[PDB]
Structures are given as C-alpha cells and as structure tokens.
Amino acid sequence: MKYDVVIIPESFHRFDKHNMEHICPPMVIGDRSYDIAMEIVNGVDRVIKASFNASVEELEGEDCDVLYRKYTLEKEGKKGIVHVKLRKITENCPPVDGNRCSVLEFERDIECIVKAIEECLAKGELNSKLEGKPIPNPLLGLDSTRTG
C-alpha cells in the first residue's frame, strides 16, 4: 500500500463573456506511504500557508481518496484553488495518468508544487477546457509558519 497524490491546481474562473476559462491538468504522484504522505503534505501545507496567502480546508475524499486537502490560494494579483486528494494506490486504485510532478527531495517536491501553482496562477485569464470549480471560501488569511 502506498498513497498516490493527485493535485489539481486551477485558477477558478467563472466563465465570463469570453476570456475566463482557466484549467490546469492534474498532477499525479504515487509512491508515498501514508507516513511519508502526511509528512510531505504537512510540509507543503505549511509552505502554502506561509509562502502564499492561502486558506486551507480539509475534506474527506471519495473512498479511493482518503484525504482531500483544499487550498484557496491568493498570491500577488493571482488567485486559484488547489485541491490535493490522496488516493490509496492499491489493486483497486491503480496509478492514474496525469502530469508528473518533478519529485526528488522535499525541497524539490515543494518547488514542484510552487511552480504548478505559480504557473496556473500567473497564466491567468485565458481560454481552456470548460471546467473550473469556483469554490467560495469565507476565510481569507494565511497561517504564519516560517521555515527555520
């Protein structure tokens, strides 16, 4: 048993007149055991809440997905939603196809997460696949935790 993380970063765009459809394809990495998964997620969580103006929300995933960590991102002039859901990669849940995050070490993994968010957020108002979940989050605030 391992856990396979699918991170879906998307700048939420309610389809406006013409140019407001921003979708970034999901990134899938499945090699982490639960213990290592929680460490990587916790670290990433702290980085997102400190390196960004992110308000996090925790949900439970659908069966195969054991955990669903929702992050509402705000960075300098950019806002998006990042949904990280963890699937239990098993013989019932095989490794899914998606974009592959450049995994190396913790620092590289987080930089890989940062580049994903920064790419999605910095591309902004464009036209893309017709999706986009504008999930309203009443909480607007980050969580102080500097790396030391």
Side-chain angles (χ1 to χ4, degrees):
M1 278 186 54
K2 287 181 175 298
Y3 291 70
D4 181 350
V5 54
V6 57
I7 175 178
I8 313 176
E10 59 186 80
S11 301
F12 48 53
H13 286 7
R14 306 181 182 208
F15 167 80
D16 193 276
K17 177 182 60 174
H18 185 251
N19 180 85
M20 282 286 289
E21 303 176 287
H22 194 91
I23 288 299
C24 299
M27 300 181 179
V28 179
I29 296 299
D31 84 289
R32 302 294 174 113
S33 47
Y34 184 91
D35 292 81
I36 300 181
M38 271 59 186
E39 188 188 305
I40 183 65
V41 174
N42 178 87
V44 172
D45 186 83
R46 291 296 174 165
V47 180
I48 296 180
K49 296 182 297 175
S51 196
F52 299 69
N53 189 31
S55 302
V56 64
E57 187 183 288
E58 67 297 271
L59 300 74
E60 185 174 88
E62 166 69 72
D63 193 72
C64 181
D65 299 88
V66 182
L67 182 62
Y68 191 132
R69 195 71 175 176
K70 172 187 297 172
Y71 295 92
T72 310
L73 281 295
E74 184 180 85
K75 201 169 183 289
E76 63 296 299
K78 296 166 292 179
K79 177 165 297 189
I81 187 70
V82 174
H83 291 146
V84 180
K85 47 189 175 67
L86 303 178
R87 282 163 288 106
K88 50 182 174 178
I89 177 181
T90 44
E91 297 179 85
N92 295 88
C93 300
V96 189
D97 279 76
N99 290 330
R100 300 186 63 151
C101 176
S102 307
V103 180
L104 295 172
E105 296 74 73
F106 173 80
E107 299 181 88
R108 299 294 179 150
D109 303 344
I110 180 61
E111 184 175 268
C112 176
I113 302 302
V114 175
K115 72 180 183 64
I117 302 177
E118 276 290 64
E119 189 190 292
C120 207
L121 271 60
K123 286 175 176 174
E125 312 83 273
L126 296 175
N127 291 94
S128 193
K129 183 189 183 186
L130 194 288
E131 294 194 269
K133 56 182 62 174
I135 305 300
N137 191 333
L139 291 69
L140 294 71
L142 76 171
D143 182 38
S144 305
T145 307
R146 203 197 74 133
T147 311

